[PDB]
Amino acid sequence: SGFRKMAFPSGKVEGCMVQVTCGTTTLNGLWLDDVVYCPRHVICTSEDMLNPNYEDLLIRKSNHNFLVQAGNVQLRVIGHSMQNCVLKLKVDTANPKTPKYKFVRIQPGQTFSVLACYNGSPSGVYQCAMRPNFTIKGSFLNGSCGSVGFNIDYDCVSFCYMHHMELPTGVHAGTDLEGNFYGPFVDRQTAQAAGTDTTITVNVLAWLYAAVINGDRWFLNRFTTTLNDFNLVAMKYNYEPLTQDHVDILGPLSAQTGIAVLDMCASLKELLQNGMNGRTILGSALLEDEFTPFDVVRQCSGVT
Numbered sequence: 001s002g003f004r005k006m007a008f009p010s011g012k013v014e015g016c017m018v019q020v021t022c023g024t025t026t027l028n029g030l031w032l033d034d035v036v037y038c039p040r041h042v043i044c045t046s047e048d049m050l051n052p053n054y055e056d057l058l059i060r061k062s063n064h065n066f067l068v069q070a071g072n073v074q075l076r077v078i079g080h081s082m083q084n085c086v087l088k089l090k091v092d093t094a095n096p097k098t099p100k101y102k103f104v105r106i107q108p109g110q111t112f113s114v115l116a117c118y119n120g121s122p123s124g125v126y127q128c129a130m131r132p133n134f135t136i137k138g139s140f141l142n143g144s145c146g147s148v149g150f151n152i153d154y155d156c157v158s159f160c161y162m163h164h165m166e167l168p169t170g171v172h173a174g175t176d177l178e179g180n181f182y183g184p185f186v187d188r189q190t191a192q193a194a195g196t197d198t199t200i201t202v203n204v205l206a207w208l209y210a211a212v213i214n215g216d217r218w219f220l221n222r223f224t225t226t227l228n229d230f231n232l233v234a235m236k237y238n239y240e241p242l243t244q245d246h247v248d249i250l251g252p253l254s255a256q257t258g259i260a261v262l263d264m265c266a267s268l269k270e271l272l273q274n275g276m277n278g279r280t281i282l283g284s285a286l287l288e289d290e291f292t293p294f295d296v297v298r299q300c301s302g303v304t
């Protein structure tokens with residue numbers, strides 16, 4: 001029993017973090033086999049950041065201008081190349097601690113764990129969601145850049161996020177491990193607008209299922225609705241519209257709880273239109289969209 005915003009164990013990611021220094025900029029890198037991945041903006045001075053030409057800037061840089069350190073091991077750079085917004089530094093030493101991994105580009109509404117780092121050292125771990133507008137509401141100080149997000153499938157680390165920058169709005173933007181931004185962002189220091197953020201309806205339903213499973217059942221009603229009808233109420237409150245794949249993904253939680261998905265939608269419909277009134281659900285006074293149906297099932301069944 002209980003319900004917490006739980007992060008994946010970080011052990012397997014901790015042994016791949018390194019510090020990368022070029023000129024006087026230092027940030028975090030990911031050391032996998034014989035390659036160190038990091039944000040390419042490591043090569044920019046301050047002036048450079050307003051309007052960087054990354055092709056010209058990189059051409060000026062030699063292997064020995066890159067200082068990759070793992071603890072008090074100093075790795076030697078023998079290669080460098082730029083893949084979109086990430087630098088790949090080929091090093092002489094393959095990471096003895098490289099886990100089973102792959103690079104995945106996640107969709108909006110998906111959750112991942114962040115290992116927040118400074119000078120290649122891990123400082124803490126948190127769970128969060130890729131917002132529908134391709135931002136994250138992170139905790140990142142200066143020199144957190146190159147901090148990575150990941151999931152664990154069994155024994156396999158799925159790397160899905162690298163942190164590049166904070167927007168003047170205070171939210172966080174970054175790339176996949178192939179160097180493509182999530183969202184319409186560019187690694188230059190210019191005023192950049194994120195879209196309208198929406199609430200991730202499918203994740204809020206997963207959370208209400210979580211609440212029922214954990215005793216909190218005051219919000220259930222005998223009312224119902226169709227998708228069509230429900231979705232129309234959802235758009236007015238800036239909730240993502242709910243598809244048939246969404247219903248399909250909640251079927252298991254539906255089966256565990258003997259509450260039809262549509263019946264749960266009808267309870268949500270009502271909460272939007274009438275709110276909580278000082279009631280809480282799993283001790284929160286707002287609706288919570290940073291758990292996937294898969295997160296709820298894992299947490300409520302005991303997956304390692």
Ligand SMILES: CN1CCCc2ccc(S(N)(=O)=O)cc21
Nearest residue numbers: 041165166167168187188189190
């Ligand atoms: C300094 N840096 C690194 C490269 C990308 C980027 C984007 C926006 C900003 S911002 N708006 O915080 O000045 C700063 C930044």
